[PDB]
Coordinates of C-alpha atoms and ligand atoms in Angstrom, one line a residue:
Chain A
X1 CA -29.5 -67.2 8.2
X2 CA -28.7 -63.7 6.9
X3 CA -29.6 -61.1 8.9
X4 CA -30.7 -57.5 7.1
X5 CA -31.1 -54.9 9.5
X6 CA -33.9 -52.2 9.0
X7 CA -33.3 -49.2 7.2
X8 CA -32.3 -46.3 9.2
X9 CA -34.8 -44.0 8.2
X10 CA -38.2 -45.1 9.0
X11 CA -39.8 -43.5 5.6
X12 CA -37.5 -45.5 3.6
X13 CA -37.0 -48.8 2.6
X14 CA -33.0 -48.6 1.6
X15 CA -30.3 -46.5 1.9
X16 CA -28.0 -46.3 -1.4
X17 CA -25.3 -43.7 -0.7
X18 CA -24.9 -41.9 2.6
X19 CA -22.9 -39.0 2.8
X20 CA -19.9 -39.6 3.6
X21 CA -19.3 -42.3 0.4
X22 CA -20.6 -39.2 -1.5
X23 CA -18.1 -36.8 0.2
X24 CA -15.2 -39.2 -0.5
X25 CA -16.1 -40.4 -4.1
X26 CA -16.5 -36.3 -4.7
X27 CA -12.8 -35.9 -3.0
X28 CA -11.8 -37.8 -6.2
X29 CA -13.6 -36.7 -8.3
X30 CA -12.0 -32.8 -7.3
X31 CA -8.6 -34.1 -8.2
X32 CA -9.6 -35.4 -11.4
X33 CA -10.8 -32.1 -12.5
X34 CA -7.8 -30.2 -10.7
X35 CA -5.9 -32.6 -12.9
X36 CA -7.8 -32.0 -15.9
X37 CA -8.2 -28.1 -15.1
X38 CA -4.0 -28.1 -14.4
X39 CA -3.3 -26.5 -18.0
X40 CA -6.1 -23.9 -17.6
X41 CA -4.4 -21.7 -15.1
X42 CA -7.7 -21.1 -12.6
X43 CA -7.4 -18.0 -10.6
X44 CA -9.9 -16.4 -7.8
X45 CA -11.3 -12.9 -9.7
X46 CA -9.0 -13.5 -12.7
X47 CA -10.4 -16.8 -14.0
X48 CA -12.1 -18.8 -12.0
X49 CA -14.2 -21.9 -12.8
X50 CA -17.6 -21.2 -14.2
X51 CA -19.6 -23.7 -11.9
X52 CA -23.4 -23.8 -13.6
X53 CA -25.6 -25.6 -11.1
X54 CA -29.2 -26.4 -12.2
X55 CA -31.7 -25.5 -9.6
X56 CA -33.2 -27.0 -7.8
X57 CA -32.0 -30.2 -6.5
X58 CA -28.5 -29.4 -7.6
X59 CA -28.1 -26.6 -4.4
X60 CA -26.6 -29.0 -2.0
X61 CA -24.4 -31.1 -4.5
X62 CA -23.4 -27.6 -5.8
X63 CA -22.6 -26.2 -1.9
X64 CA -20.4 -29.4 -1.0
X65 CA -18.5 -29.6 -4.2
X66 CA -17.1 -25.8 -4.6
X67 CA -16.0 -26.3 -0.9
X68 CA -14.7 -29.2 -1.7
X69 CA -13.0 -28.0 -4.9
X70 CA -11.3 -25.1 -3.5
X71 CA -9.5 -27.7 -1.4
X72 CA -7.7 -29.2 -4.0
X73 CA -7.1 -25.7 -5.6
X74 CA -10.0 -25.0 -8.0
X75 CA -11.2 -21.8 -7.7
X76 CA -15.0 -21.0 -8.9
X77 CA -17.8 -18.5 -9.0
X78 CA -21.4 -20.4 -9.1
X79 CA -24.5 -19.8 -11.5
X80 CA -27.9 -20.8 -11.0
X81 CA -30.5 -21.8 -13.6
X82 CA -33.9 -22.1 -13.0
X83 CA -27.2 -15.6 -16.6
X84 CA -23.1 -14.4 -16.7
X85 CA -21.1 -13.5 -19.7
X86 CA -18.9 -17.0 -19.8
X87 CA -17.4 -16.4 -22.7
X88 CA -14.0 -17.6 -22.7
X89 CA -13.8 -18.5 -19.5
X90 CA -14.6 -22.3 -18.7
X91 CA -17.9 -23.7 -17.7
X92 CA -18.6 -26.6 -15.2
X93 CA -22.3 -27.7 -15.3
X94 CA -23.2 -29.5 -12.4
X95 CA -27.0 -31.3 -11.8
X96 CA -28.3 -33.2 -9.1
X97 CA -29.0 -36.5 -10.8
X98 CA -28.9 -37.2 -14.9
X99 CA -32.0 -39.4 -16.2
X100 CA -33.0 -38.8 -20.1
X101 CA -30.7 -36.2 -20.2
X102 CA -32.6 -33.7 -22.2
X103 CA -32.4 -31.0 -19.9
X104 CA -28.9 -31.5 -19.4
X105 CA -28.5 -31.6 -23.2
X106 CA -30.2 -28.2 -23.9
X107 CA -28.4 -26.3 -21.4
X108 CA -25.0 -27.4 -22.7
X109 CA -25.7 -26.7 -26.4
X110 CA -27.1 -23.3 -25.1
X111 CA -24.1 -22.5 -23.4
X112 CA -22.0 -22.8 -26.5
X113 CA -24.0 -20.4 -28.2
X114 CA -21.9 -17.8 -25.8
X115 CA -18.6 -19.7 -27.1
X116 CA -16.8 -20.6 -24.0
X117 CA -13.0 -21.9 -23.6
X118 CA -14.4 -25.2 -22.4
X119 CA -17.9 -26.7 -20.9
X120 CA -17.8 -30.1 -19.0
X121 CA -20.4 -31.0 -17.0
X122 CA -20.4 -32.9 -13.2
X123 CA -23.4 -34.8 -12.0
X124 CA -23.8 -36.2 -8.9
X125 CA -26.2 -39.1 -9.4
X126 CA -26.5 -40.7 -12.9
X127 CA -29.5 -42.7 -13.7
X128 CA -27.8 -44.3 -16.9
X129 CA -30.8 -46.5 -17.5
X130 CA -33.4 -43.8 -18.0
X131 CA -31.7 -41.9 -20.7
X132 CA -33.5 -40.7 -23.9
X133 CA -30.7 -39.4 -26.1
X134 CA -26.6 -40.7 -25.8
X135 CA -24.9 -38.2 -23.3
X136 CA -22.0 -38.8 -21.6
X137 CA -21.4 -36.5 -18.4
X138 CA -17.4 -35.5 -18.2
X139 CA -17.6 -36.4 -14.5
X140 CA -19.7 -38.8 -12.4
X141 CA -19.6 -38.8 -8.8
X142 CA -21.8 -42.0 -8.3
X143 CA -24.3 -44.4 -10.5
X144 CA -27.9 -45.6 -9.4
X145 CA -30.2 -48.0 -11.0
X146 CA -33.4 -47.0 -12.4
X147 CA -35.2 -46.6 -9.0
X148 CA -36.2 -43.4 -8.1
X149 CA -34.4 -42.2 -5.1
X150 CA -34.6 -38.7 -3.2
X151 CA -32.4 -37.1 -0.6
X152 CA -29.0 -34.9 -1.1
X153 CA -31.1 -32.9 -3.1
X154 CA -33.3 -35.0 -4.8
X155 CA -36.3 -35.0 -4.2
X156 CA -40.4 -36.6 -4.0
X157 CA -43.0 -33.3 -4.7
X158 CA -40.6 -30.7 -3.1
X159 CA -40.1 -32.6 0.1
X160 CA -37.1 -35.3 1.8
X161 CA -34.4 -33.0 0.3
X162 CA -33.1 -32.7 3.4
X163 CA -32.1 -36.1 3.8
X164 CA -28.2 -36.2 4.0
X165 CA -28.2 -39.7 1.8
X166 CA -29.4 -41.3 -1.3
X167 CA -32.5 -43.5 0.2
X168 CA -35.4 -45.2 -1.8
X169 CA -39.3 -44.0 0.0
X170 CA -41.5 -47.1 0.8
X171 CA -44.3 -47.1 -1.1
X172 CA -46.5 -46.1 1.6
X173 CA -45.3 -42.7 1.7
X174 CA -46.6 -42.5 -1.8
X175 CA -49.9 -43.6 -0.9
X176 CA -50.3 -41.9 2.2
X177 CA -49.6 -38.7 0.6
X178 CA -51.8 -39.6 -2.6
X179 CA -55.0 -39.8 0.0
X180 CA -54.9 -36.6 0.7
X181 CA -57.5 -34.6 -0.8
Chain B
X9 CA 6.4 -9.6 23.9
X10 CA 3.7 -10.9 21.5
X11 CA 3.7 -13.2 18.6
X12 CA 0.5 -13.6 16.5
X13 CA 0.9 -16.5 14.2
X14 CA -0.3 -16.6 10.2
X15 CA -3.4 -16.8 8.9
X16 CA -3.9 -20.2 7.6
X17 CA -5.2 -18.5 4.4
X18 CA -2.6 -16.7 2.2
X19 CA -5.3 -14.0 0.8
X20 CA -6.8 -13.5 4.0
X21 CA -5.7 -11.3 7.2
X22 CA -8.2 -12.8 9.8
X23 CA -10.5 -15.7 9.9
X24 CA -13.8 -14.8 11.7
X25 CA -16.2 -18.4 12.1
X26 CA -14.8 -21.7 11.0
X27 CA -17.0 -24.3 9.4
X28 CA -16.8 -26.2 12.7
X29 CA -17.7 -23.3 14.5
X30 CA -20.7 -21.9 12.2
X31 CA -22.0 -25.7 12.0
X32 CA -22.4 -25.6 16.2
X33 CA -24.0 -22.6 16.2
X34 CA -26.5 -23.3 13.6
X35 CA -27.0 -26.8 15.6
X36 CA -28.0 -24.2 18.3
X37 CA -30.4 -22.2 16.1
X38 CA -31.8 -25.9 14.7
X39 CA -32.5 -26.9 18.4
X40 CA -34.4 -23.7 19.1
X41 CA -36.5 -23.8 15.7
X42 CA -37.3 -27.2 16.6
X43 CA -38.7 -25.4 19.8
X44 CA -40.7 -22.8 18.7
X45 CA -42.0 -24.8 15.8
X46 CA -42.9 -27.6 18.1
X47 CA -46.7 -27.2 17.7
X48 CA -47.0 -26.3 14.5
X49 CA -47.2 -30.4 13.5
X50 CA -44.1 -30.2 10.7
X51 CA -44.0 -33.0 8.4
X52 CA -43.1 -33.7 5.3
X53 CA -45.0 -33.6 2.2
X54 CA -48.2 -32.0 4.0
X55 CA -46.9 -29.5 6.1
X56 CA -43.3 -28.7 5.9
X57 CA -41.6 -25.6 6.6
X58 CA -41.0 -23.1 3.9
X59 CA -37.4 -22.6 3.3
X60 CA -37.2 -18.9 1.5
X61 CA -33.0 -18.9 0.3
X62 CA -32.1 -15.8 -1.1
X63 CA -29.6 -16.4 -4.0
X64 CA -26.9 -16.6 -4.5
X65 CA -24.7 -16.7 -1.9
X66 CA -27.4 -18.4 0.5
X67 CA -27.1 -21.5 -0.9
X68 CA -23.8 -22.8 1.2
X69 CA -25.6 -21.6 3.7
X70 CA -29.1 -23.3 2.9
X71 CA -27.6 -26.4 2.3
X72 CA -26.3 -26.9 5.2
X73 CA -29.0 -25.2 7.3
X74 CA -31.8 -27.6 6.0
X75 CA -29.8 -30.7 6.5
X76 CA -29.1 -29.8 10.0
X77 CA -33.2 -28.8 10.5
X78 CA -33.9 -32.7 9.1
X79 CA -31.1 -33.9 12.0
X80 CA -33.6 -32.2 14.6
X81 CA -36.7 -33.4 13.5
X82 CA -37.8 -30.1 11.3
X83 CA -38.8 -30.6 7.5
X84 CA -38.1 -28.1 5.0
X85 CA -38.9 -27.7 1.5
X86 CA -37.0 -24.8 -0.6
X87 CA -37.3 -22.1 -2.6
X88 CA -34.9 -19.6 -4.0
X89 CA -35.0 -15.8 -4.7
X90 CA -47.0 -20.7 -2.9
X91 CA -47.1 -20.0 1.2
X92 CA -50.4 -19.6 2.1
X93 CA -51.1 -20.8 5.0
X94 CA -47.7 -22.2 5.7
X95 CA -44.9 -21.8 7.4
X96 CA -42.1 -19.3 6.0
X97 CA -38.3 -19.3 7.2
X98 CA -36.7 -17.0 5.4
X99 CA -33.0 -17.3 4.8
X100 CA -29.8 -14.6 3.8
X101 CA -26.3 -15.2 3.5
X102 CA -25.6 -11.7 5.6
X103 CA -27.9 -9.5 6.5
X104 CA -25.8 -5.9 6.3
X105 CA -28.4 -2.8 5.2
X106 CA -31.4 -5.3 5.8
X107 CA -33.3 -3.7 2.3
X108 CA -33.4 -6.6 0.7
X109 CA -34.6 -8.4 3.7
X110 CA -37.1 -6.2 4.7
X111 CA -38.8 -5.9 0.7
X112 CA -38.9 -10.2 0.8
X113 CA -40.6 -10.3 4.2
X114 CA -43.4 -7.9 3.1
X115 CA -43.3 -9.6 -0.2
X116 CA -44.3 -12.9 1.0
X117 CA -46.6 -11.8 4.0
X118 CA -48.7 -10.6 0.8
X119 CA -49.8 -14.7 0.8
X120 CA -50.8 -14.6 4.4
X121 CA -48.7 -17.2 5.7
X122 CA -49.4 -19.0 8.6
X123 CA -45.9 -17.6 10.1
X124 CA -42.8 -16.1 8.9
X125 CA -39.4 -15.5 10.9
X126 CA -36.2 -15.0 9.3
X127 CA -32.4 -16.7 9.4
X128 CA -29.3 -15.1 8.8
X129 CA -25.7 -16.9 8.6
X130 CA -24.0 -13.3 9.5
X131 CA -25.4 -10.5 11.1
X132 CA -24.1 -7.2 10.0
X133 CA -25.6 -4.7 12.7
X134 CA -23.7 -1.5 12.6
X135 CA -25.0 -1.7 8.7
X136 CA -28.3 -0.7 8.7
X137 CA -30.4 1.6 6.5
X138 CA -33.4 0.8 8.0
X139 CA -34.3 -0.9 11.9
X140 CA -34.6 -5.0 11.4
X141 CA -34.0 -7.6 13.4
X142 CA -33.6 -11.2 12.3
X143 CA -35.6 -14.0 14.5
X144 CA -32.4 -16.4 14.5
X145 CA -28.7 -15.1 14.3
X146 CA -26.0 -18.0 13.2
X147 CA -23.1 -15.2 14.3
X148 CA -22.4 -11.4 14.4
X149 CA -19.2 -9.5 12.6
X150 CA -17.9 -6.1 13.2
X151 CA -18.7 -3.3 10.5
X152 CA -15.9 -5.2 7.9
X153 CA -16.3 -6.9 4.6
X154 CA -16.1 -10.4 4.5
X155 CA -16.1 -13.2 2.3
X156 CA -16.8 -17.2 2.7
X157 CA -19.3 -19.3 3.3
X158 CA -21.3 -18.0 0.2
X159 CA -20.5 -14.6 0.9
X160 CA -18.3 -13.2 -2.3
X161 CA -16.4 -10.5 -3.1
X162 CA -17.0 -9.9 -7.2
X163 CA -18.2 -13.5 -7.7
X164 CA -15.4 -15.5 -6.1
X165 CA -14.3 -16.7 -2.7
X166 CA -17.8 -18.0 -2.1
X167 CA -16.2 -21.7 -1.8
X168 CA -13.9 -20.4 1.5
X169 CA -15.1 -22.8 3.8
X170 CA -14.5 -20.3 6.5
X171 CA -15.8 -16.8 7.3
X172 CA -12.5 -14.8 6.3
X173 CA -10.9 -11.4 5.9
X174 CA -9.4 -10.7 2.8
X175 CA -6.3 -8.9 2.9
X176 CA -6.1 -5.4 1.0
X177 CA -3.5 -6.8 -1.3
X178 CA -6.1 -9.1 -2.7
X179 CA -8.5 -6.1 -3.2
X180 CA -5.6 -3.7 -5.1
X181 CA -4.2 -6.5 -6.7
X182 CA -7.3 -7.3 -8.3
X183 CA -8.2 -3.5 -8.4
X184 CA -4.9 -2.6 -11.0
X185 CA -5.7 -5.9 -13.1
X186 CA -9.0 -3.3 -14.5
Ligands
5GP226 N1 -35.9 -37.3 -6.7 C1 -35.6 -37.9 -7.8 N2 -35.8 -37.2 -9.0 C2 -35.5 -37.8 -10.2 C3 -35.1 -39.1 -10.2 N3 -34.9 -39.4 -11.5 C4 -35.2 -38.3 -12.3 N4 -35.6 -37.4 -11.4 C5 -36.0 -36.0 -11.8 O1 -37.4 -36.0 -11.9 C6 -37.9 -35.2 -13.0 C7 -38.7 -36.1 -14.0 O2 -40.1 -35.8 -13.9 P1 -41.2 -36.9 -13.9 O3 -40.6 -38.0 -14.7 O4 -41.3 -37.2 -12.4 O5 -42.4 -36.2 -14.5 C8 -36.6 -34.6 -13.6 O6 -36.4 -33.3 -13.0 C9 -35.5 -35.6 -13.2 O7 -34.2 -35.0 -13.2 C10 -34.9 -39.8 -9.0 O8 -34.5 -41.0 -9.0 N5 -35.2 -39.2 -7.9
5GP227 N1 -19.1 -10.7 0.6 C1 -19.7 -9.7 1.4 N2 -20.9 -9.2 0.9 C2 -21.5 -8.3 1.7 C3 -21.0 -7.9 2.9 N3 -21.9 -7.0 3.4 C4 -22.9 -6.8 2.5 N4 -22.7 -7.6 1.5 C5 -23.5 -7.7 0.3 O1 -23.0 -6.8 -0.7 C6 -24.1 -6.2 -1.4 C7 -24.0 -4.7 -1.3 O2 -22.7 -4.3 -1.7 P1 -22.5 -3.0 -2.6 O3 -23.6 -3.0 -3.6 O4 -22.5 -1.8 -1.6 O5 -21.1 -3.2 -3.2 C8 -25.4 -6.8 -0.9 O6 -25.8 -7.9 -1.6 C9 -25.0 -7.2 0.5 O7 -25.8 -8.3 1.1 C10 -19.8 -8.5 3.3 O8 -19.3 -8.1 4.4 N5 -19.2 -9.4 2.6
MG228 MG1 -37.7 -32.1 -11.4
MG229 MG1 -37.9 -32.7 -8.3
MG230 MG1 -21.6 -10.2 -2.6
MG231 MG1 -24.7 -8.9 -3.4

């Protein structure tokens, strides 16, 4: 008899990612890009990393990883989009989650109107499934089926960003906040 | 005799709050908000409280902040720099001259919210311009610039995970590159 125990949030019904697999899976994703970044000679002031984060969701994935990156030696200076003359310098997009991708296209194609040295881009959740156009994201910290999820950033009408992992809401939150009129 | 050991970062003279040590004091501040918000019936999705970040270097600080107010109970839901009727936080990396705070708080009590305080990570007394005094204080630093914890100094150091004092071989060094 298998035994599943009950989710630990009680406005969930499944828990995909806590924080601390994020935290680690982002620890290698930073030394892939201070691998990748090694020929680029990143300097605080003098040229650091262009980090683009995409408001709004992307506020916490964007606050871990810079911390995170300056561990392994990756200096930065952070953007926000709903800028900064990038060119030449290199440009590090970074979203919450990556679904059909047409935002995420039309921000990077944007970008290299102002001719930068390089643009990658670093999501935190991708949503493979749900994409609308072929785009590839340079760096991935984790993959999700094509359920919606919220938490870490994400989130359901402005509200469960808070939670510090990747859950799935029962469906009677949905309801129980659609009566309500 | 005295020995004072070296920093443990090379471009800075002194380090001021750790992460640790910021973290504990805003799980102080979370307990207390969790207090004086205890009647107000937080939830999420109908009623949660209005997180008011004021970019850019807030958002280390705001991150952290509002998953520390979901450990104690208090829902948030963020904006970055409508309320009426709600509940308003306000949030600010450092809070030095207090201008900009004081021009958002009498922006936003324009909406009549239902309440509005205000949370700084750094308080910068000896700074003002003008009298202001934040509802919740995270920590307090002498009349000094620093950088960390979303605080910058020309768009970098904001990723220091600690409050820090650059050394003033970091500032010429960077002042005879142009
Ligand atoms: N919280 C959350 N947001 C998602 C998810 N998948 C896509 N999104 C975001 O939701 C928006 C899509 O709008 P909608 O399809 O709800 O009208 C986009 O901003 C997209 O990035 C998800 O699984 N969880
Ligand atoms: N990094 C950092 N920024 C500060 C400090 N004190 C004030 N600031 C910020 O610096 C700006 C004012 O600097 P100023 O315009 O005088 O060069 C304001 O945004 C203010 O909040 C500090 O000690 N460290
Ligand atoms: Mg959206
Ligand atoms: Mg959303
Ligand atoms: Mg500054
Ligand atoms: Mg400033």
């Amino acid at each position: 008899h298998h035994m599943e125990p009950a989710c630990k949030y009680d406005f969930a019904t499944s828990v995909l990612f806590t924080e601390a697999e994020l935290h680690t899976r982002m620890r290698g994703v930073a030394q892939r890009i201070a691998d990748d970044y090694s020929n680029c000679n990143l300097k605080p002031l003098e040229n650091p990393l262009v980090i683009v984060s995409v408001l709004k969701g992307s506020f916490v994935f964007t606050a871990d990883m810079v911390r995170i990156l300056g561990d392994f030696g990756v200096p930065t200076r952070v953007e926000f989009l709903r800028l900064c003359d990038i060119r030449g310098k290199h440009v590090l997009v970074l979203e919450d989650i990556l679904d059909t991708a047409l935002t995420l296209r039309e921000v990077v194609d944007s970008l290299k109107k102002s001719e930068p040295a390089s643009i990658k881009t670093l999501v935190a959740i991708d949503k493979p499934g749900g994409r609308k156009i072929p785009f590839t994201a340079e760096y991935v910290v984790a993959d999700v089926p094509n359920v919606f999820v919220v938490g870490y950033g994400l989130d359901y009408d402005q509200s469960y960003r808070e939670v510090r992992d990747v859950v799935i809401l029962k469906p009677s939150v949905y309801e129980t906040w659609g009566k309500e009129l």
